[PDB]
Amino acid sequence: VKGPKHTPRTPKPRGRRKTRIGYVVSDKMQKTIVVELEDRMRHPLYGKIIRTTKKVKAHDEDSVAGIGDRVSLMETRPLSATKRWRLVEILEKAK
Amino acid sequence: ANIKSQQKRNRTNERARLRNKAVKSSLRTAVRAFREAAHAGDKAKAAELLASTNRKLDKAASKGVIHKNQAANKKSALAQALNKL
Amino acid sequence: MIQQESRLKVADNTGAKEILCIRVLGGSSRRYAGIGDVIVATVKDAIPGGNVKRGDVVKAVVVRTVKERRRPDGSYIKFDENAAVIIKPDNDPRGTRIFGPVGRELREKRFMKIISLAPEVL
Amino acid sequence: AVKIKLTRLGKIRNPQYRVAVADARTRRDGRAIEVIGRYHPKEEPSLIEINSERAQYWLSVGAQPTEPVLKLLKITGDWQKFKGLPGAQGRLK
RNA sequence: GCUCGUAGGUGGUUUGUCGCGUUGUUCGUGAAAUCUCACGGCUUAACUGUGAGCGUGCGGGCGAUACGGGCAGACUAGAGU
RNA sequence: UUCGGAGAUACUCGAGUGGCGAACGGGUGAGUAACACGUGGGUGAUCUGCCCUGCACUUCGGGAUAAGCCUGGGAAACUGGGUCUAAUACCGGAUAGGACCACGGGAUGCAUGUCUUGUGGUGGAAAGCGCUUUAGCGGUGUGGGAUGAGCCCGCGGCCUAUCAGCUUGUUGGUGGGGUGACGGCCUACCAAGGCGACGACGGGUAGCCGGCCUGAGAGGGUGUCCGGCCACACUGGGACUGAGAUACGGCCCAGACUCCUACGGGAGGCAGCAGUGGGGAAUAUUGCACAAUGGGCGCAAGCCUGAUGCAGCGACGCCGCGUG
Numbered sequence A: 001v002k003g004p005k006h007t008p009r010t011p012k013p014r015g016r017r018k019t020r021i022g023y024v025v026s027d028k029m030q031k032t033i034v035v036e037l038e039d040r041m042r043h044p045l046y047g048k049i050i051r052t053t054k055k056v057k058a059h060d061e062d063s064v065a066g067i068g069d070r071v072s073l074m075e076t077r078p079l080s081a082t083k084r085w086r087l088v089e090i091l092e093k094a095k
Numbered sequence B: 001a002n003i004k005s006q007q008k009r010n011r012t013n014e015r016a017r018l019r020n021k022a023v024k025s026s027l028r029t030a031v032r033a034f035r036e037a038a039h040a041g042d043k044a045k046a047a048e049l050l051a052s053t054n055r056k057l058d059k060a061a062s063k064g065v066i067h068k069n070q071a072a073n074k075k076s077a078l079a080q081a082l083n084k085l
Numbered sequence C: 001m002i003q004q005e006s007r008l009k010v011a012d013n014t015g016a017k018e019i020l021c022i023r024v025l026g027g028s029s030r031r032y033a034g035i036g037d038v039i040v041a042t043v044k045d046a047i048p049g050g051n052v053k054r055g056d057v058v059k060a061v062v063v064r065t066v067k068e069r070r071r072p073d074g075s076y077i078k079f080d081e082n083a084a085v086i087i088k089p090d091n092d093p094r095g096t097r098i099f100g101p102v103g104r105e106l107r108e109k110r111f112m113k114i115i116s117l118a119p120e121v122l
Numbered sequence D: 001a002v003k004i005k006l007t008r009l010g011k012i013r014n015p016q017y018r019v020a021v022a023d024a025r026t027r028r029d030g031r032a033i034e035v036i037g038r039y040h041p042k043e044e045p046s047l048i049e050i051n052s053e054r055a056q057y058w059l060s061v062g063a064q065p066t067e068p069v070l071k072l073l074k075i076t077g078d079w080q081k082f083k084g085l086p087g088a089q090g091r092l093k
Numbered sequence E: 001g002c003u004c005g006u007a008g009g010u011g012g013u014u015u016g017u018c019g020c021g022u023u024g025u026u027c028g029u030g031a032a033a034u035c036u037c038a039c040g041g042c043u044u045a046a047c048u049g050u051g052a053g054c055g056u057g058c059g060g061g062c063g064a065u066a067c068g069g070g071c072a073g074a075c076u077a078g079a080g081u
Numbered sequence F: 001u002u003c004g005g006a007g008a009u010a011c012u013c014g015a016g017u018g019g020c021g022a023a024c025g026g027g028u029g030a031g032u033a034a035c036a037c038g039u040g041g042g043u044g045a046u047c048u049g050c051c052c053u054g055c056a057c058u059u060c061g062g063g064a065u066a067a068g069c070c071u072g073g074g075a076a077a078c079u080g081g082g083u084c085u086a087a088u089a090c091c092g093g094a095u096a097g098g099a100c101c102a103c104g105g106g107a108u109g110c111a112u113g114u115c116u117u118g119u120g121g122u123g124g125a126a127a128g129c130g131c132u133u134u135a136g137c138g139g140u141g142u143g144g145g146a147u148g149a150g151c152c153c154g155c156g157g158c159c160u161a162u163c164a165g166c167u168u169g170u171u172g173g174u175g176g177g178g179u180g181a182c183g184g185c186c187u188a189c190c191a192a193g194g195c196g197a198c199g200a201c202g203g204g205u206a207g208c209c210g211g212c213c214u215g216a217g218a219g220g221g222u223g224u225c226c227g228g229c230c231a232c233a234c235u236g237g238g239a240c241u242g243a244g245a246u247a248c249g250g251c252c253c254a255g256a257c258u259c260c261u262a263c264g265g266g267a268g269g270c271a272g273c274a275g276u277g278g279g280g281a282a283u284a285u286u287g288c289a290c291a292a293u294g295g296g297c298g299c300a301a302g303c304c305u306g307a308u309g310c311a312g313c314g315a316c317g318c319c320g321c322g323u324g
């Protein structure tokens, strides 16, 4: 007879997305963008630094992007079969 | 089968499937009827049948024949369907 | 009616799927094999790795024919295929089971095992 | 349901026991959510210990202990101090 | 056999910046059991329990920029005209 | 009261209806080179029965049916017909915000978006069962936890180029459908993209792991007891109920194998605990207890538990001790 009828939600910090940066190579597939990621990691036994790349897909709510386009991205819920990323901000446009 | 409970359990399963069948036949025929109403764009019978359609859909949700998430999915679906009629 | 140089499909599981009638046993110059007549045959093709190998001279009994056969009661029996089952010299099938319907004429020719394991006898 | 059950980790001739919180639909020697005590029934009185401040947390959130653990829970007194009984004090020796 | 050259690997001197590699610290995780240290008890042992390491790795924050890397430049010593 | 039957009223309770459980639990490693596994993250894109907590409600009714009884058919397996009866089984209602739509506020961002609200118009829930006279078990609508789970992703982890072109629902988008949920998961249309020499596609092999063996370490071999994860359950394909399904001892179908038939038809799945046969050089008792713990159910006592505790056999291995 005395309770608040709504126990408030326990304050939980918002889990953040993961952001990275890469170029673009291909653009003519209709609001989809392809960012070619980069990563360097210590070779497990010979101990060298190996340069390994990626080729991954990110969203464009507006289909404007040249070739190059150092841009940044963070994860999302899948919007296609192999869609996992979203473009966030475009910097140093394709020159 | 073998277990004394298993025969009884199947005897309940047939009851469940049949009484469920009545319900999903009802709601399928009714969503088809609503599509008949909306495609014609009468907007009078289409306006007044919602009082029956969401009524039986929520009846289905309460009795658990289907689940409330897809229930909401369908009701939003036809709500936005008439929202452009 | 089955005669020499007639191919019959095999209605058993010995491995042979088609045999070629060599002789119609049951007398000199006997021409046709009806339902329940015993045939010596050569296996013209068999399943790979099967028990009964291609080019094997075997004994078989005709169990279904596409030519209609009279029963004494004036009825007739007709199948869509000519089929025989490979048998041992004691009239028991070489295989372990019979596929497809079987003419009842094998009952009074003492192919009782074949009758027993046939899916259904007409 | 989340259970506070008595999980067996002993030898043939010694039944040492170690108390945690785990889901009911789980085997004994499985993954326990968190370890909160131990129980060795071989000494003269006993060997008993419960954390006594996560046990309150689990009992408050709804981790129901089993029938051998409920007795031990009255013994450590957490049951009485969780149910508001006048015997809130622990009574072990 | 020799050369050219693709990917790749690797790269002179110097300025400023980023801090990805690298590196420092903390937090979280790295289950339990296993292995190591110390005790305790099964007559000792094998075995067990408890406390401390291990869990080399990864994620977040706060530092650094010597070296490597990105960027914006500069030099002429390498290279070419 | 016959001397061996009646008397449900009556504790007690066979057969019967309903709920929960049966998805936990145990086994095997065939398949699988894969987000299957190890490690770390995202879910503003999600589900989660019974457990805990905060708040309102239990309000009117109806109609069937099992079981039972009388009977029919069939070899049985099983099944048809006719009366009759209930319930926390089923159906109809009234009110109820955590459905929806639209229009708005107020907070925060990481974009689709998130929460708290208001207005209006629509909507959906339940139940009773016992009492030595302060024995008690319930149910329903929801907010939040706890737990379990689902999905997605970075990194890591075999051989092989005497496998170089693979991909068409493939790559993306829109509108839909579908899902618990995002998603070509599916579909209509449109464009022609995606993966790959950092090894695509293919071939071979293989359950993976904490670990175990070895080694000074790095490495090499291996994945057996235990424990975690996955996959499977005679072979292959599919749905159902239910919160929850590779649904080992559930269902549907096809296939192979063994059995009964009165030949029309049916039943079975030890990689559960044993144990049998067969292969091998070779690995065991058709035992006891629910005493303990974990689990299932019931207000409870209590019943079930080949999980579990044990016990028997094999020097099979380690340790200890004797045969002075």
Ligand SMILES: [Mg+2]
Binding pocket: A079
């Ligand atoms: Mg889209």
Ligand SMILES: [Mg+2]
Binding pocket: B005, B008
């Ligand atoms: Mg039952």
Ligand SMILES: [Mg+2]
Binding pocket: B025, B029
């Ligand atoms: Mg209909």
Ligand SMILES: [Mg+2]
Binding pocket: B073, B077
């Ligand atoms: Mg939808």
Ligand SMILES: [Mg+2]
Binding pocket: none
């Ligand atoms: Mg040169």
Ligand SMILES: [Mg+2]
Binding pocket: E004, E005
């Ligand atoms: Mg060169």
Ligand SMILES: [Mg+2]
Binding pocket: none
């Ligand atoms: Mg080059």
Ligand SMILES: [Mg+2]
Binding pocket: none
């Ligand atoms: Mg370079």
Ligand SMILES: [Mg+2]
Binding pocket: none
């Ligand atoms: Mg340099």
Ligand SMILES: [Mg+2]
Binding pocket: none
């Ligand atoms: Mg000692």
Ligand SMILES: [Mg+2]
Binding pocket: none
């Ligand atoms: Mg010691």
Ligand SMILES: [Mg+2]
Binding pocket: none
């Ligand atoms: Mg130890």
Ligand SMILES: [Mg+2]
Binding pocket: E055
């Ligand atoms: Mg550890």
Ligand SMILES: [Mg+2]
Binding pocket: none
């Ligand atoms: Mg010069």
Ligand SMILES: [Mg+2]
Binding pocket: F013, F014
């Ligand atoms: Mg009874």
Ligand SMILES: [Mg+2]
Binding pocket: F022
């Ligand atoms: Mg089962």
